[PDB]
Amino acid sequence: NLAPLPPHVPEHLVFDFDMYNPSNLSAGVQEAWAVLQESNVPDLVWTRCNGGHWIATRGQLIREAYEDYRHFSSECPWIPREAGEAFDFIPTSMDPPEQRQFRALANQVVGMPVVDKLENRIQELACSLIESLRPQGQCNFTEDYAEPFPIRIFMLLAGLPEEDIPHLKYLTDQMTRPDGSMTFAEAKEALYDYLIPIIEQRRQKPGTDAISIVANGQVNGRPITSDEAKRMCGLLLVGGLDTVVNFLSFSMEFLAKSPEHRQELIERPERIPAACEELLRRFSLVADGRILTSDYEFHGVQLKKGDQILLPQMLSGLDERENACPMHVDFSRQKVSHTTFGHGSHLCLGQHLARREIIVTLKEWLTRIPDFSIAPGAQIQHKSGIVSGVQALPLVWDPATTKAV
Ligand code: HEM
């Protein structure tokens, strides 16, 4: 259950939050993590759950920590400690300066110039999927659209066969929202086990897919090793399969319950990109962290070298000190303050691909199925972890209120 309180951690700063099953989960995951911003909760607390660790609860602290890599290192970014010690993905497990050389390489495979190229492809797939669903007046969103749409796009970007999707996604989910059937370490090993032969192959005979791009690449002008290429390709895999997939579900669940919000985007589709930022803020879903490199006093609190600290990227934008009425989705919100794609030198490299996928989904779906809702009796369930998700999303709609385009 709870790890004993280390001697240096003040008893009054204890707030036993469990990031993998928070107490108020039933009210929605975002709402569940928002209990850390309750009236009598401090900016920095210590939880005894999951081996024991700090949690910064406010945007001000989360951004500061993310900026100061000298004290808050990416070397051990996952909780529990076992998992963060085993976590060696590139470039996430590395801090500046040696970190940058790899971001540049990774930005060649998912960056903006690559996203633009992907445009038509992305629309074709979203339009393909929706039109096929349109006449049926129902669908379970997670399996019929949230997963296939982004995953097939990445599998194509990666040059990897779709048949391997069931296996890879299972490994991916074990890493972010563990089943208990395997440790982060075991799931990482399998991921690596899958990539090793593929990377050797792409190096032997170079293709134009993200995998061979990475594996035949250079960093700081020098050849990348097979091992560095594996560590980086596995992280790319995590991003392509378990991020947008979940976010699309939180947004669509919201739209299914918000006729007025849908009418706004139906009426002025030009508000869709704005609406995407506000949904990215409101349905923020990532939370990883750092490890203290040395004894350090932070905001009046004594941190010790080795202490792990959770810096929920999700929390910043729900922080009322950044955005008034944080839980209200306001497509017109004047300043949408968030750290959904992270903060600091580790800013998400897939963010551009992620927005495209979102804006396109929103645009192509609202245009064909403007009116829909959540299947009657459905008790939508959320799931929490490094990356939070939606268990199932049964949608229903009257076919006669739809249009083909
Ligand atoms: C809604 C979608 C997404 C969200 C909210 C998101 C969020 C994040 C966050 C919060 C981080 C920072 C982690 C840290 O600082 O420890 C990150 C890093 C990263 N993400 Fe994204 N991500 C998304 C989609 C994607 C996609 C689609 C990809 C590519 C397949 C991707 C690739 C990466 C990579 C390569 C990094 C590491 C950057 C580094 O460590 O320098 N992400 N992402």
Side-chain angles (χ1 to χ4, degrees), residues 66 91-92 99 103 110 154 235-236 239-240 243-244 247 285-286 288 290 313 340-342 345-350 353-354:
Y66 274 126
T92 313
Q99 176 226 179
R103 279 185 66 80
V110 298
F154 172 82
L235 181 98
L236 292 181
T243 60
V244 179
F247 184 74
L285 75 179
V286 191
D288 73 340
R290 303 298 187 246
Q313 279 101 338
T340 293
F341 286 120
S345 73
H346 281 276
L347 263 52
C348 176
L349 292 172
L353 179 57

Side-chain angles (χ1 to χ4, degrees), residues 63-221:
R63 283 228 188 47
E64 183 163 353
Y66 274 126
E67 290 170 3
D68 179 9
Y69 57 83
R70 268 66 171 62
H71 288 109
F72 302 100
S73 169
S74 274
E75 217 278 348
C76 189
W78 279 33
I79 285 155
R81 188 180 291 290
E82 297 70 275
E85 284 173 346
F87 185 107
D88 69 345
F89 291 122
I90 288 182
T92 313
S93 66
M94 302 178 83
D95 305 306
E98 311 84 351
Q99 176 226 179
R100 290 106 169 26
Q101 69 191 141
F102 297 99
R103 279 185 66 80
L105 183 54
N107 240 333
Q108 262 160 58
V109 292
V110 298
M112 189 67 107
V114 182
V115 159
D116 292 314
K117 309 312 194 68
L118 282 173
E119 264 291 304
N120 306 160
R121 191 75 188 64
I122 294 187
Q123 194 191 181
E124 195 281 2
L125 178 51
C127 285
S128 182
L129 252 7
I130 303 180
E131 180 48 39
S132 169
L133 296 178
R134 190 177 55 69
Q136 334 180 315
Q138 65 176 29
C139 72
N140 192 293
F141 193 67
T142 57
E143 13 177 347
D144 309 338
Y145 189 85
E147 294 156 3
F149 173 59
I151 297 176
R152 296 183 183 162
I153 276 179
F154 172 82
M155 290 304 261
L156 162 82
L157 167 68
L160 304 162
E162 305 190 347
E163 72 189 349
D164 292 315
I165 288 177
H167 179 69
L168 301 172
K169 190 66 180 67
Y170 164 75
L171 295 179
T172 269
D173 290 14
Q174 287 330 302
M175 282 178 129
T176 61
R177 304 168 291 277
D179 225 354
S181 58
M182 46 187 309
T183 62
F184 167 79
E186 290 158 0
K188 189 193 69 172
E189 282 326 301
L191 186 60
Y192 283 169
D193 180 66
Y194 165 85
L195 294 166
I196 282 184
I198 304 180
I199 279 169
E200 190 180 293
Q201 267 110 85
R202 253 71 164 198
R203 179 175 276 235
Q204 302 170 161
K205 177 165 183 184
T208 83
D209 54 287
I211 308 271
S212 29
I213 300 282
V214 169
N216 290 87
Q218 310 208 64
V219 288
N220 147 230

